[PDB]
Design an enzyme around this catalytic site. Structure first.
Site, PDB file in Angstrom:
ATOM      1  N   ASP A   1       0.830  -1.203   0.000  1.00  0.00           N
ATOM      2  CA  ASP A   1       0.000   0.000   0.000  1.00  0.00           C
ATOM      3  C   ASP A   1       0.862   1.249   0.000  1.00  0.00           C
ATOM      4  O   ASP A   1       0.556   2.226  -0.694  1.00  0.00           O
ATOM      5  CB  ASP A   1      -0.949   0.001   1.199  1.00  0.00           C
ATOM      6  CG  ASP A   1      -2.122  -0.959   1.012  1.00  0.00           C
ATOM      7  OD1 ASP A   1      -2.568  -1.147  -0.138  1.00  0.00           O
ATOM      8  OD2 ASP A   1      -2.592  -1.527   2.014  1.00  0.00           O
TER       9      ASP A   1
ATOM     10  N   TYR B   1     -10.162  -1.680   1.797  1.00  0.00           N
ATOM     11  CA  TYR B   1      -9.608  -1.531   3.131  1.00  0.00           C
ATOM     12  C   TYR B   1      -9.436  -0.077   3.539  1.00  0.00           C
ATOM     13  O   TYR B   1      -9.177   0.848   2.769  1.00  0.00           O
ATOM     14  CB  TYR B   1      -8.238  -2.215   3.306  1.00  0.00           C
ATOM     15  CG  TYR B   1      -8.463  -3.626   3.741  1.00  0.00           C
ATOM     16  CD1 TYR B   1      -8.008  -4.704   2.972  1.00  0.00           C
ATOM     17  CD2 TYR B   1      -9.160  -3.894   4.921  1.00  0.00           C
ATOM     18  CE1 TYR B   1      -8.235  -6.033   3.375  1.00  0.00           C
ATOM     19  CE2 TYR B   1      -9.404  -5.211   5.363  1.00  0.00           C
ATOM     20  CZ  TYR B   1      -8.915  -6.280   4.561  1.00  0.00           C
ATOM     21  OH  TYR B   1      -9.119  -7.594   4.921  1.00  0.00           O
TER      22      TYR B   1
HETATM   23 CU   LIG Z   1      -7.498  -8.292   6.911  1.00  0.00          CU
END
Ligand SMILES: [Cu+2]
Ligand SMILES: [Cu+2]
Ligand code: NA
Ligand code: NA
Lengths: 620, 620
Positions: free
Chosen positions: B290, B374
């Site tokens: 990320d 996320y």
């Molecule tokens: Cu997770």
């Protein structure tokens, strides 16, 4: 109305009268423990019967007794005479603390040791410490305390800054004899004071802290009924109090739609031991069983609003017995409040355009106890998402010694000539489980690594494995942080909507367990502390991991004896015992008063619910 | 004034102008990364020279460039052409994400695969994911994204509830070519919706939650000067922001009496990797970097008062560059506030009669980022007692797949037919240490158990050992929770009043590290993640544990290449790199939106101070 209500002053007064009339509470008698008994197993128990268990000490030397009384019917149910050389001595009495210093003050050996060090006996405080079981055959069957000395320069001085090393005394507190005075040599008494309210040590107090105001303008979200029954954000439980264990949580359940689902039948800290790792003969016997030997509930603090507990606080004031059977109230001894706990769930979704944030909260149930130099906070937390957490907060003043010239492998230096011996603080949580009912089992869950090869051509796969613990002889487990080891308590007869057994997962902190040699006295008496997890079959009389009478018991009582029965625990009424602790190498920053350090554990749902249980939390 | 001030909109516009004037930013160019460079080592140095590092992409296929510019002097300092097949591709551009779904919607292989599943292409969302390096030779030197499909039944639907398993496509986002479409077979698309704001799923919202009001009537106790310099309760630091790393802490120091004592020169999360453990060819390539591939600062949320951050909040609004060099402000992207943190120290002394209680508090610096499904919160905490702590909070929607009919060893079932592959979330903290200055060393501290025998006759002693890490080749270390392993960063040339080197102790959570096979692509690219602790000698160009260009880069850069230099780290300018992470086996309770789970680390003073540093905290 509830069988789990706190003991009242009236109940304790009736117990006193019943004992009195039965001839069990004469002037030579002292109550060393008094507590209410939980109802026996019975999912239909109807008749009110409040029973109390009492340990009665005799100061004239007669045999002590264990007595069970029914306050409902006004009768003595049983009274057993105890052979303490066999089953252990009774807990230490608060009044026996003063006796140690008074007896030593007139002992010629003690006075000569003080005279050699030019210490005024009127300024020497003696910490009265539990004796344990070591090499002294004359102590078997006798009630012994050991004393270590500290100098108080003036009445408000912190005596912990001035240990008198090289000197220890043993005292029979029943016959009032000093059995041994051991003087191994003169150490300088550290001279710096440790008075943390003296402005010469603190300096000018900070003027930079602005207030934080935490209020609940509509009052708290929880209700208290029947004195100690809590309802809060789908949780339901009863808050008990016992003079030995402190706060006990009963009947922890969660309202899932229309169903009240049990999770834990009884949660408590059933023992805590503080073993010292200094091999000096002055201290190599030193091990506190704060719960089992001293009774942490009887030293609970009154908690001050705005200082100890901040916010919209609801207090409970438990009642205990003094040594003569009179009720004694611990005013504001338990704090209960809710607090904000940050973000609960959050997602900003590109495709749907929905931005979603919810805040978390936790319910806090806490008390603080003071045992000599240490102060411990016990905190139970309930979270919106079904998580249950315990946290112990250790503070107070570290136990001190001289710092030897030339250093030490087992003692930290805190100030010139002032040492602090290495030690641990190890807790045992007893969790009488009831996941969706009493048919439970424990599985150990390890991460599984997989090798690159057929079916895993890119070498990325990993998995997990679960091993059911089926009998008590295989239910003594150790942590393994490297493999992510956790333990799941499930109900094999209660399934979620995916047809999987409902469960809760125990997450340990994976701190070191008892470090003492396996052959040592403390390893035998605190065997629970040598392993991270134990599972037993429930039994009414298996209450403490160290047995009922911890003081001067020779070893093996409690968990090693229970486990030896090797009972079936696969889909049965089971109890989880989790060992966890702090290993304390004292640092300079711990002196002269220690900032809080913490340890704990938590349990999280693991397929207990059919989806997230906090979808109905509003945005506010 | 300060060289550590946040980049201003004017500085970013000036970078754009300098690049344009120099001929480096024509219409075919895109800025993939732009950030301010830290001052080189040297107190004072060049008065004021703000330099920026820029990665420039070319949409026509020409080689990208790395450029350094001085905004103060209006000059290009250096400009190097990059050979991406060797040193890695530039980070993914926001505008490339949209390309993937659009290109696939016109590809005959993709349309045939969706027709076989009776899916309307207009309802199929494609998650565009980083490609990694695997067996496909045609991808070397090309910018590739891989696409996974999800069905959105209506515009506000959560597409994550409806994965289209058995299907993946690879796209060249520069040539605008679909290179491969792989279809391993039809799986049913799970039909249940996951719409966590739909009243049909939430049920009636709770009405039981009463408000918690947190206010500071006199304002906060911290001050902000120069835009981003913080002073709070003896702490001093600068809050930076970088589009790759997010929040960066500079110049963490503690005012001890009259002296400002450095502790940490620079603290950041320098990489974070999310590897998936499902061996299906549809997902066995899936690994998010990320930080290195996507740039977490680029996706920072605007945080809403009273929802994301509660209390008396001070915001920073950092400025980043868009792909054309225009400044873009992230309004309210950083929240700063202080929080009550319970009891700090407490003791009730029987002998002195003094009762003493003090309360703790912490300073919180946080931001939240959203990358696809996320959402991650990054929290830095400073405590009154000198403790520094980092906490990552993981929430959002779990990544989904089909749940295979016969079960799976690598996927959790969340709902009928809906699976969630196992994965990890692993962070690397880069701590450029400066304990009382730049002359530091690291010691590994283990508990030492001692055998009963001579000098330890009662078998109670225990001790500890410290091992100095002297060269980079021996400074790659693993956790050992069973032995209580910690690491101490000390300054051998700065002693406390007891003549001991001052230090700070790093306490890890001891969670499992990378689980993938050591021969795998991800283990080579994320080598940092295979060990808990690395120590390097400071060097200006050794910024990230994975190297500068992570996207589609094989192994060969980052921490393994740095430590091969085998430099002296014993009393030198050193950098600590700590790996920590969560291993996520998804549970039913994580669906349809995941309650927060957390991981982190903390640093505590270890003889840094001459006594407790919070003796001057007032009682309030
Ligand atoms: Cu997770
Ligand atoms: Cu301690
Ligand atoms: Na049970
Ligand atoms: Na450094």
């Amino acid at each position: 109305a509830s069988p789990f209500r706190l003991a009242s002053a009236g109940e304790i007064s009736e117990v006193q009268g019943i004992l009195r009339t039965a001839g069990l509470l004469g002037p030579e008698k002292r109550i060393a423990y008094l507590g209410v008994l939980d109802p026996a197993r019975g999912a239909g128990s109807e008749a009110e019967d409040r029973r109390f268990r009492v340990f009665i000490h005799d100061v004239s030397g007669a045999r002590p007794q264990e007595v069970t009384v029914s306050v409902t019917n006004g009768t003595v149910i049983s009274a057993v005479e105890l052979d303490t050389a066999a089953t252990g001595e009774l807990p230490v009495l608060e009044e026996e603390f003063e006796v140690v210093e008074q007896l030593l003050a007139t002992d010629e050996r003690w006075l000569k040791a003080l005279a050699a060090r030019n210490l005024d006996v009127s300024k020497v405080r003696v910490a009265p410490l539990s004796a344990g079981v070591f090499e002294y055959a004359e102590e078997r069957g006798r009630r012994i305390l050991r004393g270590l000395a500290f100098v108080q320069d003036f009445p408000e001085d912190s005596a912990w800054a001035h240990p008198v090393d090289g000197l220890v005394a043993y005292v029979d507190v029943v016959s009032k004899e000093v059995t041994r005075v051991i003087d191994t040599g003169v150490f300088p008494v550290p001279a710096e004071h440790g008075n943390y309210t003296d402005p010469e040590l603190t300096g000018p107090l900070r003027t930079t802290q602005k207030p934080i105001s935490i209020t609940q303008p509509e009052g708290p979200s929880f209700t208290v009924t029947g004195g100690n029954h809590i309802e809060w954000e789908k949780w339901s439980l009863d808050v008990g109090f016992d003079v030995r264990e402190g706060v006990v949580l009963h009947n922890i359940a969660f309202r899932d739609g229309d169903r009240l689902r049990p999770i834990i039948n009884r949660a408590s800290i059933a023992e805590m031991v503080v073993p010292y790792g200094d091999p000096s003969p002055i201290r190599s016997w030193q091990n506190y069983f704060d719960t089992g030997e001293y009774l942490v509930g009887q030293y609970a603090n009154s908690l001050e609003l705005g200082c100890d507990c901040l916010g919209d606080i609801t207090y409970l004031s438990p009642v205990i017995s003094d040594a003569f059977g009179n009720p004694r109230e611990i005013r504001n001894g338990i704090c209960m409040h809710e607090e904000d706990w940050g973000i609960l769930a959050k997602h900003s979704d590109l495709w749907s355009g929905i931005n979603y944030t919810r805040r978390n909260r936790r319910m806090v149930i806490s008390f603080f106890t003071t045992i000599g130099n240490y102060d411990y906070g016990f905190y139970w937390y309930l979270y919106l998402d079904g998580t249950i957490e315990f946290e112990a907060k250790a503070t107070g003043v570290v136990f001190t010694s001289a710092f030897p010239e030339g250093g030490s492998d087992n003692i930290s230096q805190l100030a010139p000539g002032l040492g602090a011996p290495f030690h641990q603080h190890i807790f045992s949580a007893r969790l009488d489980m009831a996941i969706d009912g009493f048919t439970n089992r424990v599985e150990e869950e390890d991460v599984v690594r997989q090798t690159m090869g057929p079916g895993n051509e890119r070498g990325n796969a990993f998995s997990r494995k679960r091993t059911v613990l089926t009998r008590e002889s295989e239910a003594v487990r150790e942590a393994d942080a490297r493999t992510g080891r956790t333990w799941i308590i499930s109900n094999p007869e209660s399934k979620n909507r995916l047809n999987e057994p409902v469960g809760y997962k125990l997450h340990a902190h994976n701190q070191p367990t008892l470090l003492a040699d396996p052959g040592s006295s403390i390893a035998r008496r605190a065997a629970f502390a040598t392993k991270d997890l134990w599972v037993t079959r429930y039994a009414d009389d298996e209450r403490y991991p160290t047995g009922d009478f911890v003081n001067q018991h020779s070893g093996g009582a409690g968990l090693p004896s229970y486990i030896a029965q090797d009972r079936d625990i696969d889909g049965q009424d089971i109890v989880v015992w989790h060992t966890f602790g702090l290993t304390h190498f004292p640092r300079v920053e711990d002196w002269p008063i220690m900032p809080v350090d913490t340890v704990g554990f938590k349990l999280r749902p693991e397929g207990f619910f059919d989806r997230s249980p906090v979808l109905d939390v509003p945005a506010n």
